Motif scaffolding. Structure first.
Motif, PDB file in Angstrom:
ATOM      1  N   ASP A 214      -0.409   8.958  49.515  1.00 37.87           N
ATOM      2  CA  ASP A 214       0.051   8.063  49.449  1.00 37.87           C
ATOM      3  C   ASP A 214       1.549   8.854  49.364  1.00 37.87           C
ATOM      4  N   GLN A 243       6.684   4.768  48.549  1.00 40.32           N
ATOM      5  CA  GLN A 243       4.470   4.976  48.480  1.00 40.32           C
ATOM      6  C   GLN A 243       4.375   4.981  49.644  1.00 40.32           C
ATOM      7  N   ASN A 244       4.565   3.676  50.568  1.00 39.86           N
ATOM      8  CA  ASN A 244       4.354   3.016  50.969  1.00 39.86           C
ATOM      9  C   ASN A 244       3.953   3.472  52.270  1.00 39.86           C
TER      10      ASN A 244
END
Ligand SMILES: *[B@@]1([O])O[C][C]([C][O])O1
Ligand code: NA
Length: 263
Positions: A214, A243-244
């Motif tokens: 992540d 995070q993405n």
């Protein structure tokens, strides 16, 4: 002060949006080139080298250990099981688990290696025994890949991981057959074509282990044999603020291309 190499790596980092860590060891003379070399980064699957090596070390005194079959049950499967899923209600030997963990980055296989060592702390204990005072493994798969900013779990530094990879593959942290086996496994890796290898001359032999997690965490650790020259060890760690975030293997290839100049 900074060298032109470090200046180029800083410019690459600035363009990338993330945080880049690099460590090169030149075994011709033991010199090191570092960029954020003493900052911690999430290891993700690069930690599988330490786990496989710890099992190799156990096999130095239990000489049939790599042949031992380990049962794989449905409940053992985690998030990425390309090899282990072919052995549900079957077995894989410790050698097969090591090859799957290293060469396909199988996460079920890594969990079996961790369990063979008595848990994440057993992997860390092996690291300490070979002189790595920095590595820590805290969790199993898949949670060891959360890669949360500021979280020290499942981290190391580029300098420490380069030193360890050197000792495991070129030095003698492992016995002679075990060191050769680790080198063979790393050379046969299937997951590294777009990472460090993509930034190096195709005539150089490379063994590597990638990592992904992540926060767009994109990592690779490699041992490199140029044809007419002493070998090198290179760690490239990269992580991003979101995070993405998507993977950025191109950043690792670009770091390798910078480092290769003059080698
Ligand atoms: B490591 O980082 O390599 C792939 C797997 C995916 O969870 O972990
Ligand atoms: Na395999």
């Amino acid at each position: 002060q900074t060298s032109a190499v470090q200046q180029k790596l800083a410019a690459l980092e600035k363009s990338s949006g993330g945080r880049l860590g690099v460590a090169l060891i030149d075994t011709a003379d033991n010199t090191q080139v570092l960029y954020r070399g003493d900052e911690r980064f999430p290891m993700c699957s690069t930690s599988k080298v330490m786990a496989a090596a710890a099992v190799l070390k156990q096999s130095e005194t239990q000489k049939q250990l790599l042949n031992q079959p380990v049962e794989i049950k449905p409940a053992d499967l985690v998030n990425y099981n390309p090899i282990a899923e072919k052995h549900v209600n079957g077995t894989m030997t410790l050698a097969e688990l090591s090859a799957a963990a290293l060469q396909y980055s199988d996460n079920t296989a890594m969990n079996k290696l961790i369990a063979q060592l008595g848990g994440p702390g057993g992997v860390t204990a092996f690291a300490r025994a070979i002189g790595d005072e920095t590595f820590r493994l805290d969790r199993t798969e898949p949670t060891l890949n959360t890669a949360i900013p500021g979280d020290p779990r499942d981290t190391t530094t580029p300098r420490a991981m380069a030193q360890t990879l050197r000792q495991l593959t070129l030095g003698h942290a492992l016995g002679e057959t075990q060191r050769a086996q680790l080198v063979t496994w790393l050379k046969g890796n299937t997951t590294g074509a777009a990472s460090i290898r993509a930034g190096l001359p195709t005539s150089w032999t490379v063994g590597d282990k990638t990592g992904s997690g992540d926060y767009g965490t994109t990592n690779d650790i490699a041992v490199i044999w140029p044809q007419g020259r002493a070998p090198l060890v290179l760690v490239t760690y990269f992580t991003q603020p979101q995070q993405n975030a998507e993977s950025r293997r191109d950043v690792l290839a670009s770091a390798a291309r910078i480092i290769a100049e003059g080698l």
